[PDB]
């Protein structure tokens, strides 16, 4: 059992992008607690969203989290040029705890 992300999207500056992460088998319940992380290259990963809709202090307001259908979605509205980074989704399975995705490289054109 693993979590899968798509490899990449590209977004125009000032546009809205929706990254998706999903379980290989089954649904992504809100009890799986998706957590989205942003890693600028040359920098450690940063906590963007925990518990599917909440943001720690210092995270900009443009990041939003949701669960759509049977997957978790990170929506960036009005993405700037500082968002070009590697984006990781992590789901809390009961036995294996946090399982992190492969990583989606968001390209800001």
């Amino acid at each position: 059992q693993t979590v899968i992300q798509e490899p990449a999207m590209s977004v125009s500056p000032g546009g809205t992008v929706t990254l998706t992460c999903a379980w290989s088998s089954g649904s992504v319940t809100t009890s799986n607690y998706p957590s989205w992380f942003q890693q600028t290259p040359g920098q450690p990963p940063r906590q963007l969203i925990y518990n599917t809709n909440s943001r720690p202090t210092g995270v900009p307001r443009r990041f939003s989290g949701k669960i759509s259908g049977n997957k978790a979605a990170l929506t960036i509205t009005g993405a700037q040029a500082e968002d070009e980074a590697d984006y990781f989704c992590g789901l809390y399975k009961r036995s294996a705890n946090n399982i992190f995705g492969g990583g989606t490289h968001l390209t800001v054109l």
Binding site: Y50, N51, N53, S54, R55, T57, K66
Partner: protein, 487 residues
């Protein structure tokens, strides 16, 4: 069998916050008492949106209503480990936050809507208003003159909820003498002041009190003066002064305090965002006049606002007629203030109101190991959604005093003397003692209601309180059973 005439309003199409006008036509011989009948329409708050987690929104009465993130306190910037927040309906049903048109606020009515509806009532005969009173005189004569046997009748007339008594069932009990089956009795309310999603249309039957509504022998004739010139003017209260809102959304906070024992405190904080209450339609607005077929006691009332500290001497010049027993109530201005969250519940209270909150938790301690079994392995602290609020009327006056023109008269009498003893000894069966310690009375005759004969009559008002200051003020309202002559 005398009939009640159903006279329509003179102005027509009445609206809350606007003046209402009644006329007195000629259909009988004498008119003794009159009653305003209204049907208030249904009330329901507008549908709102459940907030997204982490969003703190400006709310009512200067309160920042917060739906904080997981792991933080009620303040959204204070960490609190283990705290997980959900949105629940006041009955415990989930809301799924973010869903539009799911949160709808429950709506009150104010306590005693029939008193607050007739905010200012005056009677005119080609102008020159003979009688004029307000809602404060009505709640004073409710607290003093209306007997306890007819208390449920007055509560049904003005649309106050009455306590329905039910029973639980047989219980274990014990008998300690130095075993028996016993039922538990509970009280609950389903009336207007109960917060409801859809308040039903309500029947207000407000009695009109004048000098000629007491004795049938003192009822004024309908032929001595023309019926055209007799008019009644009422100032109806606003919709915001009659209907309040209850928080229709509660942030439910689970909190796992790790350790031995591992407590799980679950609390509920209301999410109060004001909506748009629908406009109240006044339907079947009638006035019932008892036009039966075939010296006076005019009550002179006045309202004063006071802000002095430790000595508040107020002099009046309107009172010229001799004065019998006199009810005085010093209501705080914050009671009827719009900034009061409990304005609707605590408007009819002449003392400093506070709230005692029960938070009855459901404590349960569970052990897992079957080996250690001394300190429990887990606990639980499930609180109720709505905490129990007792309104306490703390006294507002320490030493009331009424000084006459030349003699001392009433000088620094304690409020418990004028609020409890004087209603207890003077007045007889008609004058009950009010439950409100702020409301009090000053007596001037030996026989207030025991006989229809003047047994004593006749001016400053002063209290040495400890509540009224620069930011805290007060409102004196009076009701004196003065005597007038009519010819």
């Amino acid at each position: 069998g005398f009939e009640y005439n159903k006279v329509r309003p003179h102005t027509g199409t009445p609206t809350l916050g606007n003046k209402l006008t009644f006329g007195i036509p000629q259909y009988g011989d004498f008119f003794h008492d009159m009653v305003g009948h209204h049907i208030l329409g249904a009330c329901h708050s507008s549908w709102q949106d459940a907030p997204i987690q982490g969003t703190s929104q400006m709310g009512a009465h200067g309160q920042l209503q917060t739906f904080p993130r997981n792991g933080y306190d009620w303040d959204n910037q204070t960490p609190l480990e283990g705290a997980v927040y959900t949105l629940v309906d006041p009955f415990g049903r989930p809301i799924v936050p973010g869903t539009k048109n799911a949160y709808r606020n429950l709506v009150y009515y104010c306590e005693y809507p029939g008193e607050r509806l007739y905010e200012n009532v005056r009677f005119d005969v080609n102008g020159n208003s003979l009688d004029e009173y307000s809602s404060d005189v009505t709640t004073l004569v409710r607290k003093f003159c209306i007997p306890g046997d007819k208390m449920t009748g007055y509560k049904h007339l003005v649309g106050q909820e009455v306590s329905v008594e039910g029973t639980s069932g047989p219980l274990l009990c014990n008998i300690h003498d130095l075993l028996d089956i016993r039922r538990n009795v509970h009280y609950s309310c389903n009336g207007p002041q109960t917060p409801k999603y859809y308040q039903p249309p309500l029947a207000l039957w407000i009695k009109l009190r004048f000098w000629f509504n007491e004795n049938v022998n003192l009822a004024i004739p309908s032929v001595s003066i023309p019926f055209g010139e007799r008019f009644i003017t009422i100032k109806l209260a606003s919709q915001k002064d009659l209907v309040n809102e209850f928080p229709g959304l509660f942030v439910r906070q689970s909190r796992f305090i790790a350790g031995r024992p591992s407590r799980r405190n679950i609390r509920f904080k209301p999410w109060f965002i004001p909506g748009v209450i629908n406009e109240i339609s006044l339907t079947n607005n009638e006035l019932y006049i008892n036009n039966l077929f075939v010296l006076i006691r005019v009550h002179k009332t006045q309202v004063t606002h006071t802000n002095n500290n430790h000595h508040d001497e107020k002099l009046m010049s309107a009172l010229k007629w001799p004065i019998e027993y006199m009810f005085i109530g010093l209501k705080p201005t914050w009671n009827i203030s719009d900034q009061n969250p409990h304005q609707h519940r605590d408007w009819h209270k002449f003392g400093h109101v506070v709230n005692a909150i029960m938070q009855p938790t459901h404590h349960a301690e569970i052990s897992f190991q079957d080996r250690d079994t001394a300190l429990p392995d887990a606990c639980s602290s499930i609180s109720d959604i709505s905490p129990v609020t007792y309104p306490i009327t703390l006294p507002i006056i320490k030493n009331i005093s009424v000084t006459a023109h030349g003699i001392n008269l009433i000088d620094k009498f304690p409020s418990k003397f004028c609020s409890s003893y004087i209603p207890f000894h003077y007045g007889g069966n008609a004058i009950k003692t009010p439950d409100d310690p702020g409301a009090m009375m000053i007596t001037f005759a030996l026989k207030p209601r025991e006989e229809y004969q003047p047994s004593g009559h006749i001016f400053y008002i002063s209290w040495d309180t400890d509540y009224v200051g620069s930011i805290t003020t007060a409102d004196l309202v009076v009701s004196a059973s003065a005597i007038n002559f009519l010819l």
